[PDB]
Design a protein around this ligand. Sequence first.
Ligand SMILES: Nc1nc(=O)c2ncn([C@@H]3O[C@@H]4COP(=O)(O)O[C@H]5[C@@H](O)[C@H](n6cnc7c(N)ncnc76)O[C@@H]5COP(=O)(O)O[C@@H]3[C@@H]4O)c2[nH]1
Lengths: 331, 331
Amino acid sequence: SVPVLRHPHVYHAFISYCADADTSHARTILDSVESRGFTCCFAERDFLPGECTSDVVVDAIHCSKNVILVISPASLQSEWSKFEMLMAVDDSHQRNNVCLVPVLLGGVKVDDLPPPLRPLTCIELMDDFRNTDDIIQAISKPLLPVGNLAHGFAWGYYYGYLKIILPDLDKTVRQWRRVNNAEGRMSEKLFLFFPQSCRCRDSIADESSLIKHRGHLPIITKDRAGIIERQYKNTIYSVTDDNGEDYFFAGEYIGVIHTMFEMEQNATTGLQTREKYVQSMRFYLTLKRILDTDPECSKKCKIVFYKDVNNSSDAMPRLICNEIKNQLRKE
Amino acid sequence: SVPVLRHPHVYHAFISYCADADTSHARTILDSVESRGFTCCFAERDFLPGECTSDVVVDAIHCSKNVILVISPASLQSEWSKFEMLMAVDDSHQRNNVCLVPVLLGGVKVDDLPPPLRPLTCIELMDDFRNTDDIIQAISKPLLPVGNLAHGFAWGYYYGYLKIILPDLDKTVRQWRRVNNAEGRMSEKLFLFFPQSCRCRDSIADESSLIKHRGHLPIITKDRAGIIERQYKNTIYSVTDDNGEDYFFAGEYIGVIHTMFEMEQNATTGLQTREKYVQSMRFYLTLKRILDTDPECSKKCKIVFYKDVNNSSDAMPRLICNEIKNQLRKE
Ligand SMILES: Nc1nc(=O)c2ncn([C@@H]3O[C@@H]4COP(=O)(O)O[C@H]5[C@@H](O)[C@H](n6cnc7c(N)ncnc76)O[C@@H]5COP(=O)(O)O[C@@H]3[C@@H]4O)c2[nH]1
């Protein structure tokens, strides 16, 4: 049938092709699909000659339900296969398998496909264009897909935050404990907490009545991303040991991971509690691999992974105490 | 030969296997690899019985150069193939092809492999374990790999920022223009600027002497990720039209994309100027797809993609003017 179009969708399908060698093959598929009612976006007739920029191709993809990907032996050699073809390929295999319609011409060897396209289910179109009705089937089919979050979270957290606060953070923390007379009861490392469920708390004082907000480090003011005087503040807390003595520390959660928790709770999002654990562990590895490259930032902070499934109002305070032990022992 | 170990690497290889059906096959490969000098991490002997948690497996992967992935017909059915096996698979095909050593037992059909493993180059190990020396080759080989950043950037930017400021932002902007008497010369939509090169500026006033910092919106103070009183501030600028009249607007860059610029400039990072354009366009699509789901946030802001390759000190001011035109016209 002719599926009705969602609001952003103005085309039924966008024909992604290599204009050097398959601009004639793509035009043939255009007629085969539009003859049976569908409205497609063909670059030669629907774009302006000078308005074939990368963003214009992207808007057509954003405004089309499906994307017919024309792949030929000659197209895999041109720069199109390593540039504009990939802009129609999503990381989420869920969206790829529903949105992308690969069409293999001539040599249909799936092994020759780049790694992005190799695990996809493609249609073999004969040299006489007889499987053209197979293409029409994938366009008639009328839960948000989730790609991989590990690399985006880790690289952004490093360049966009850790690279900002961690340089000369030792002096800032040591100058804080000397002013407040916290020697022997406060470390100099920034503690980044990584709960297993990724459920970040508004304040570490929400874990137990033993954690108390005790101040903050000097505010880092920076004009970034067009926001003038964006504040980067680090909060100081304190835990009470079993011996009634207060140990201080600069602590915070890895707040970027809280998105994985919110996506898991959002029933419309395609991220279940099982993949959340996978995405969080790929994030843990990637971030720790990035920190190994920068030794002046890695050893100025301490990542602490733990489970937060138990309801013990004492499990979290003693964990922070046992974590400051190592830091004070190493000093 | 026996390759020397990098600092975090304490094992030559981590044997990732399904303990239900291949715990005996994995032990066989352990002896075949350790007999020739390599130090491996085998779960049955190197982990404690109760200390086989997901994070412990991850630390072993972080502390091993290579990862030998044992894959059998019976392992693809257990939950291990859909959970712990994927934690050794990186999104970056560059790191995967160098670090991951897939070992196919019994049925070696690459089509049966999940999409993460299907585009990989695997070793067929016979039922008599004769290709065991092939495994040793991939472990002897002694530029940072970059996965895909689109989904991590887009989902984080939405839940972690847009979902915070955009609700009831119309009243905040309209209350700002009514107080400063900016009717007819100021819109009510937040302008998110998306330069093609991803080079975000510290202040939009850095584009031209016509852009002036003219204040900010009321500060949004929130305890998030354990940081008490984290400020979310939106800056107000003003452009000067060709007629000398000042048009106001709330504007800012999509600062998450600046990481792609810094990774491109960092010569050690495996992200060139060509993939940066690909990753930025996958990000543009993914973010706009996310915003379509939330119609109360999408239509309260305006993404503006443009080229910033020219040095025109007038191209940017007139672009902001032509962008406020549509918003004032639609009011
Ligand atoms: N614990 C903690 N304290 C902070 O001050 C802080 N600031 C940033 N981050 C996290 O590190 C990374 C920095 O990347 P980036 O700035 O490019 O993207 C940011 C940025 O583009 C935008 N954003 C967030 N907060 C603001 C803000 N106050 N003003 C403007 N834009 C903002 O939304 C993206 C994601 O924000 P978060 O989801 O809060 O986590 C960030 C991010 O993962 C912080 N983490």
